[PDB]
Amino acid sequence: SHMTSATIPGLDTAPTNHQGLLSWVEEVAELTQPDRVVFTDGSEEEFQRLCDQLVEAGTFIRLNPEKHKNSYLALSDPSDVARVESRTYICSAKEIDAGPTNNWMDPGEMRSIMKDLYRGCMRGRTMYVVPFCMGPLGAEDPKLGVEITDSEYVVVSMRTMTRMGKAALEKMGDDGFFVKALHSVGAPLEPGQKDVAWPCSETKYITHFPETREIWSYGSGYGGNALLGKKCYSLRIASAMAHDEGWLAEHMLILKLISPENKAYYFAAAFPSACGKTNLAMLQPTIPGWRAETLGDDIAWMRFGKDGRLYAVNPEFGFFGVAPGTNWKSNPNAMRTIAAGNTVFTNVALTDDGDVWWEGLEGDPQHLIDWKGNDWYFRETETNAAHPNSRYCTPMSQCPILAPEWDDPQGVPISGILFGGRRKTTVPLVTEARDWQHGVFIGATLGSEQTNVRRDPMAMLPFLGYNVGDYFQHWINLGKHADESKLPKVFFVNWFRRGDDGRFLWPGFGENSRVLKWIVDRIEHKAGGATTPIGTVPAVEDLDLDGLDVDAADVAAALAVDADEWRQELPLIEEWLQFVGEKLPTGVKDEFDALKERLG
């Protein structure tokens, strides 16, 4: 019953222009034993064909086209609803090159386990070969990949999240390099066996081989586990590439801010989860003459240009956003993006008229079908209607405030890099670093609230493809060797500082544009601030608070730098620096020592 790759339907008609690709596909198919192989082209005809098949399988239902054109709802197995960090691995030759922020296993050992799992795993299924490009196709060092998957849901979402199909395949030419990304849901079928809507396995691995730039995923069909052009490539493999190649692959939104002068400024900003980063990515300024446009809300790849500035490009082609919390009152721009359709929603609730809903959204719907397919009733049912990690997957080109530069292969020059977290105390509303190395320290020690303060360096804690210490040294090196006058200025922002009574000291949301204005003025040397032990911090009089109904005392409190509080912060930072381990750069320790000395 086992078939030699040659005889598997679809391989007879494979593209032969790139033999490295063909040989790999044949080797994989020989192992996994699919019923047939399909090379995807990313076309609209293909997209609708795959969607019809997904509706037939029950994986999708078609949403009301009057409310969302060409849009679908998928409900997952309740065991498969999120990234699984504990099952995510960096399999470098040596453990130290994974480092203390990563899960490591000997690559030989991992390969033995996963090759065993992959044997026959695609029986009864189509194996898709999905060529894709990271970033605009016009790039100079363009990063290509091919994802092999047995999940049609994956193919459809990869079409939205990446530049998928024909154009990428042509870019590979006859022997071009590409990231080999292998995926299976791990649910082989017998002939004539009825499938389920969302196949998956209890056994999961999301494995990365940084040296060879390979990704092997098994067992999950969900999000970042299975859409391998998301963080597996965009952050984990790409950070290793960037390490070796002299650039930066980072977990940052990309924002375009335009001043009343009509001059544009681009910012890259790293936040952990639960810090409202999507709200900031789609900022609507509240002060006259200031406008904002978005280039991305997840990943930024930064490379030096010929002029010595750092240029950012978004490697992604679509948004994969957490649905709950998204609503018309706080992110109308996200809602408008979704309104234009062409969206796959996963684990949200279904309204009686074929629309979608999730916690936080307006409407007070009286009845819903929840993410498990069950009746839900307003102000009665005690379970969430949409899964807390439910998703919309939507083309970026539909965003009404998308910057025209979004598809430029050279990207946009970055004026400022921002780091942020949620802190009830201690950390002011905004601080500017004293210089690049201090900036690296600020990013490296990024703290944010946890069940208490979690360190999430550059918001990359779960996503580094190599040792965290070496990553810090890489940031230090790029700054050392750059033209200092052209490096982005580094800032830290805390929108979330609280008074002792629990009030929010800063109103946030669109009002964050007032902080961004200070940042732009500092870049232009048009604003002052106080020199404090932690960096430059504005006084209330340094911010534009015109038209803002806010207690000046609350804003002063938001901006305060209390030496006692920062002395208490020191041992927390020190235990983190110790955790970083043997590869902690002396340059980072230097900045800790300097902070300690300034504090007295």
298 is in an annotated binding site: yes
Cβ proximity of 377 and 367 under 8 Å: yes
367 is in an annotated binding site: no
CA distance 538 to 520: 13
Helix (H) or strand (E) holding 215: strand 214-218
Residue 337 tokens read as 């993006």
308 is in an annotated binding site: no
51 is in an annotated binding site: no
Residue 510 lies in a domain: yes
Closest Cα partner for 412 from 286, 517, 191, 257?
257
Residue 1 lies in a domain: no
118 is in an annotated binding site: no
Catalytic positions, written as ranges: 275
Helix (H), strand (E), coil (C) string for 403-443: CHHHHCCCCEEEEEEEEECCCCCCCCCEEECCCHHHHHHHH
Task: Indicate if 475 and 446 belong to the same structural domain.
Answer: yes
Domain end position, chosen among 367, 400, 433: 400
For residue 367, what are the β-bridge partners?
Answer: 377
Residue 41 tokens read as 């082209």
Task: Indicate if 256 and 219 belong to the same structural domain.
Answer: no
Residue 513 tokens read as 């544009």
471 is in an annotated binding site: no
- For tokens 């995510």, the residue is 88
Angle, CA of 143, 236 and 395, to the nearest 5°: 60
| 321: amino acid identity, one letter | G
Resolution (angstroms) equals 1.6
For residue 432, what are the β-bridge partners?
Answer: 491, 536
Here the CATH number for the domain that contains residue 293 is: 3.90.228.20
Task: Indicate if 181 and 290 belong to the same structural domain.
Answer: no
Residue 2 three-state SS: coil
Residue 160 tokens read as 């939205």
Q: Which domain holds residue 434?
A: 247-316+401-600
Residue 279 tokens read as 């709200």
Closest Cα partner for 439 from 472, 481, 485?
472
Residue 114 tokens read as 């996963």
| 292: amino acid identity, one letter | A
CA distance 437 to 480: 8
Closest Cα partner for 54 from 223, 188, 196?
196
Here the CATH number for the domain that contains residue 133 is: 3.40.449.10
The torsion angle over the Cα atoms of residues 122, 127, 131 and 135, rounded to 10 degrees, is: -50
Q: How many domains does the chain have?
A: 3
Q: Name the DSSP class of 217.
A: E
Residue 361 three-state SS: coil
The torsion angle over the Cα atoms of residues 567, 572, 575 and 577, rounded to 10 degrees, is: -80
Domain end position, chosen among 381, 400, 419: 400
Burial 94-126 (b: 16+ CB within 10 A, else e): eebbbbebbebbebeebbeebeebbeebbbbbb
- Rg for the chain, CA atoms, rounded: 24
Here the CATH number for the domain that contains residue 376 is: 2.170.8.10
Closest Cα partner for 498 from 549, 451, 544, 554?
554
Method: X-ray
347 is in an annotated binding site: no
Sign, CA dihedral 217-222-225-231, equals positive
Task: Indicate if 583 and 512 belong to the same structural domain.
Answer: yes
Residue 166 lies in a domain: yes
Helix (H) or strand (E) holding 159: helix 152-161
CA distance 123 to 130: 19
Closest Cα partner for 527 from 13, 537, 244?
537
Q: DSSP per residue over 466-528, as a string?
A: S-HHHHHHHHHHHHHHS-GGGSPEEEEE-TT-B-TTS-BSS--GGGHHHHHHHHHHHHTT---
Residue 91 lies in a domain: yes
Q: How many CA atoms lie within 13 A of 556 on its CB side?
A: 4
Q: Name the DSSP class of 202.
A: S
Residue 4 three-state SS: coil
Give CA 553 to chain center in angstroms: 36
165 is in an annotated binding site: no
A 10 A CB-CB count for 365 gives 18
Residue 2 lies in a domain: no
